[PDB]
Amino acid sequence: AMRQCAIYGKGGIGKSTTTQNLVAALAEAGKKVMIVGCDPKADSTRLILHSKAQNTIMEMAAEAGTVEDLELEDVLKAGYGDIKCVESGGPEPGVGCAGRGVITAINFLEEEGAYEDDLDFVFYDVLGDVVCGGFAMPIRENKAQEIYIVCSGEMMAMYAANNISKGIVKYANSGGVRLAGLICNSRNTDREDELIMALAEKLGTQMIHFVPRDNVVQRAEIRRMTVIEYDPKAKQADEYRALAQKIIDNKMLVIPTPITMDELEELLMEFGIMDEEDESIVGKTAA
Amino acid sequence: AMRQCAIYGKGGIGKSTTTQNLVAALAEAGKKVMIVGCDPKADSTRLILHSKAQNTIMEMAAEAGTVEELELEDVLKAGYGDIKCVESGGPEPGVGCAGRGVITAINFLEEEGAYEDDLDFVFYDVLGDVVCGGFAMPIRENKAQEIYIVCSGEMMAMYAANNISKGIVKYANSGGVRLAGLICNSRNTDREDELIMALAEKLGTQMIHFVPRDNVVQRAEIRRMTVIEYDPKAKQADEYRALAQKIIDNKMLVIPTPITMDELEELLMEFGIMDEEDESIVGKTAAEL
Amino acid sequence: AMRQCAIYGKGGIGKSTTTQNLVAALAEAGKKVMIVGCDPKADSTRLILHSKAQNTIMEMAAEAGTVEDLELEDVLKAGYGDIKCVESGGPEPGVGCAGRGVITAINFLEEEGAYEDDLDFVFYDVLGDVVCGGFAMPIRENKAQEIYIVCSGEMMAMYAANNISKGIVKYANSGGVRLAGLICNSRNTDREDELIMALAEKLGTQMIHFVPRDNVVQRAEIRRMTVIEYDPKAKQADEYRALAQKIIDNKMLVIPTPITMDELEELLMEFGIMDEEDESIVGKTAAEL
Amino acid sequence: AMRQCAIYGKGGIGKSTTTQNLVAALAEAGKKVMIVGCDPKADSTRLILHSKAQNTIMEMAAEAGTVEDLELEDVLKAGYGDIKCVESGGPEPGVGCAGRGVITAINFLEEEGAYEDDLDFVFYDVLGDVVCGGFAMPIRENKAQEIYIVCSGEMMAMYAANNISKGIVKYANSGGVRLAGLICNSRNTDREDELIMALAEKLGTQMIHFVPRDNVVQRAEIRRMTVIEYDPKAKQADEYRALAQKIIDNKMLVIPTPITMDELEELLMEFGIMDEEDESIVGKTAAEL
Ligand code: SF4
Ligand code: SF4
Ligand SMILES: [Mg+2]
Ligand SMILES: [Mg+2]
Ligand SMILES: [Mg+2]
């Protein structure tokens, strides 16, 4: 029973670093895992491979003309703990949709039997900033059943988490896409955990883990590796094992209940992220 | 002589706040301006209208028909300096295309006569992060002739500027969509201005204005207004006026020259945005070494 | 019973702002309070007087000849909630001892009957980075019997908290000086509450209150006033009222048990303030690894 | 001709890091340097010695019983480039004076013959926050002719630089103590470089060098070393060399011109560090609008 998961979140909150660290922890737990990158704005395999930038399917397509000309050897590389790594390749700037690329790639792996192994998990690393048809393609085509959202106590991070839930709600009726949990990439802020726990509560889900900020992540990042690999004894390592072990044991798969912009702002203000609004100063000149 | 302009850039660097502030400067200078928010996940008109969120074209279409049903009066609101304000609205989570929404909005506004009315400038506030077919829709359909790029001295904001320039290069043989300059939104970091100037020379453009950080910006955003409106005497207010001025007189429209990822890494690593790599230590564990 | 208190801690963590907000909360609870400024690098009475820089006893005495020509009225002002405010004035650069100016202030206040019987609290706002002889004067001279340490999760603020504790141990069996509690000035950090509680655990004291980081404090600071006065219906206001009340009902005075530098580092590493060291690569050049 | 210098500056701005990387660049250039640490809150020698904590004169003397039965080998350690490293030790918490232990350390080093013929520089690393008599001890005793003030474009760092400048003025005629320049220790901020030069112009001095923020410094420090030793190929290394070279070549030893607090505020404001004071809201309640 291979589990088809995806990680969704906006960019610039460390979504990909967490994806790779968690996956490494799976490999260290003796799970066989594939990472499929579906994010143009981040490398989703660099830390597993030790590479700078894996060649994507989209740019290897030009090398021979079409994806039917491609060998699976060129696209799918093995790295740490024999984690299987692939990068779809983002759209050509101005002349491409991101759904089409991710379809192209997922069917290529299907045709070539990448999904035909003793594979325990596949994790699609997906950009979930602006949740259009394109980035919602793994959901729509039912290519990921278990969605995890990487977010944080930042406004836009939680907005993204809310739209991602909405996107899910769309194709919930159709296919078995569910929300597995929220993952908090800490910003080393106070009450951030509680914030996301309360957001989870309202979404009808769970904060499956709080991922702290810890310099050992960056120290592993310099060496193009995960923390699991770099330093198994780091206290950060137990943090990714906890997340990983919780995903494995996870049986909580819901249809989320998105929230309103006021219902959100209410959260922000409750946990001291946003301040209580004051209309007496609204529209009022300094003179 | 209406000039159709777009501001492209990524989220989280205050693109919209610069657009609103810029536009308030123009109105204060006596120009008539319309703003078409084409950024999902951004309130592009909130400072002009003193509103928490404008009604978006896409969300009122949720009723039925982004045409007919929708009335320009329920779409287009005037605000500070008689600035006309429109919010296209983002795509339906999971289903719709963002560019399809934007064009529909723009088509609606054409079809309802908004682009008359004695307009000196219209500004499209467009998301330009992952510049897909979607967000390059206003370029392909030549809905904006001049493109300004909001960027900061940050990896991703500079990679977006790059992808925005590739998208302009893709359609420069079709239409007359040209890059007008980079606007740098400060992160209050050393050497940021030099960084962007270097990006400009490579992209084949100019850093048209350096927009400093200043608490008077947030102070005005809190009150849901621009600095130009909140305190025109402020020093930050003079900066937005200078931006507005250089845009009015801007005579430089170019086909940019996108750089390669190595050339981009070369540039970060000059200004220390990226660290120099010690590749001897790559793949090495804490125990080994 | 006029409780003779002192706030100690290093600069740059908002010690003073907490003191004044705290003392504002006491004077709103109908208390009679005197703040004596014993910190050269902080205006300890600015927010109470709505004043830029209160004139110090050392400044005034020089423009007079001596502390004997000095009138009480130029040196002790009443502010919000009729709080009495005094500023000792730090040492003359290069010559004077921070302590000597403090003792002059205290003797002048004692000489001129500034310490009234009705008074419910005196707070000394004392610098507490380097806990030398000069800055431990209140404690040596038995003027400060109840010490509150304003700290935070940054190393120097905690090291300083430990050094102020060692200062207390010295005079605890000469006079009745006791540590009353730690006061966390939050840097909007994760686990910072748990850190100071665990520091207090080791010291024998308690973390009496955690003061949040809230922008209304800054909004109030800017207007040279406390949150108690600026906006009583603010949530931060309730946070100072909490602190003040806990202070009012505090019966836990103790002799602290300072900790080894090894123990301190054990705490910072456990709460992520210090990094776990990679001792193998110590002293190694990047060329040799 | 040995040159007796001193690095004054406030805590927490990486003064001692700059000191040690500076001496490394002097040593790389074949100069004989001794670092004498006079900071209670900092290791002035750890990066040279690759050691967690050098034993101080205070504690070593505390062990023996007096400083007359203390051997030179015990305190004076050699490190990278055979830089001589010494640590005065801070004051006995609550009782001690910081100037007592520094005069002690200097007399010992004198008698034991640590100040050798071959030595080209000695540097005292003194905490320069509150410039009392005790911390001005190297100046008063005329043990430091050249003073370099580390600072940054921040209120309190510039204030401390100001107070140090008054400390020099005081003993300027008596001794031969001059100010040699400011060293800006970057916080990666805009206009900070323009600010410290402007301060320098008001003190009647110069900015000798602007030290960038660069992660390599922390990469070196984690391994308990200077950049010069970590990686002499890094752009930072050259920065420490430029600083060191300019110091070697420096011919600008002045008596400073300290500025008023108002003058310092005018500088902060001119370079966007402070906002202009809105006196129209000082005293004013939130509800009072
Ligand atoms: S559907 Fe989304 S990814 Fe595809 S072109 Fe439109 S905006 Fe871009
Ligand atoms: S006791 Fe403290 S304040 Fe007094 S001179 Fe010595 S170091 Fe300075
Ligand atoms: Mg090791
Ligand atoms: Mg007396
Ligand atoms: Mg190397």
Author numbering:
A (entry chain A): 2 to 288
B (entry chain D), C (entry chain C), D (entry chain B): 2 to 290
Sentences from the paper on this structure:
Nitrogenase provides access to bioessential nitrogen via the reduction of highly inert atmospheric dinitrogen (N2) to ammonia (NH3). In all nitrogenase isozymes, H-subunits form a homodimeric reductase component (‘HH’) that transiently associates with and transfers electrons to a catalytic core. This catalytic component is a heterotetramer composed of two D- and two K-subunits (‘DDKK’ or α2β2) and contains the active site metallocluster where N2 is bound and reduced to NH3. Three previously characterized ancestral variants were targeted from phylogenetic nodes within the evolutionary lineage of Azotobacter vinelandii Nif (wild-type, ‘WT’): Anc1A, Anc1B, and Anc2.
Anc1B, by contrast, is composed of ancestral H-, D-, and K-subunit proteins. Ancestral variants preferentially bind to the ATP cofactor and exhibit the same general mechanism for N2 binding and reduction conserved across all known nitrogenases to date, but with decreased activity for reduction of N2 or other substrates. Given that most ancestral DDKK substitutions were not close to metalloclusters, we hypothesized that those situated at the DDKK-HH interface might have modified the activity of the ancestors by impeding protein–protein interactions that are necessary for electron transfer to the nitrogenase active site, as well as cofactor loading and complex maturation. Additionally, two unique single-point substitutions in the ancestral K-subunit—K211N and G307N, specific to Anc1B—are likely to impact interactions with HH E111 in the ATP-bound state. Positioned centrally within the DDKK-HH interface, these substitutions alter the electrostatic surface of HH. In Anc1B, the substitution HH S177G is located near the interface with NifDK, with G307N in Anc1B NifK identified as a potential interaction partner.
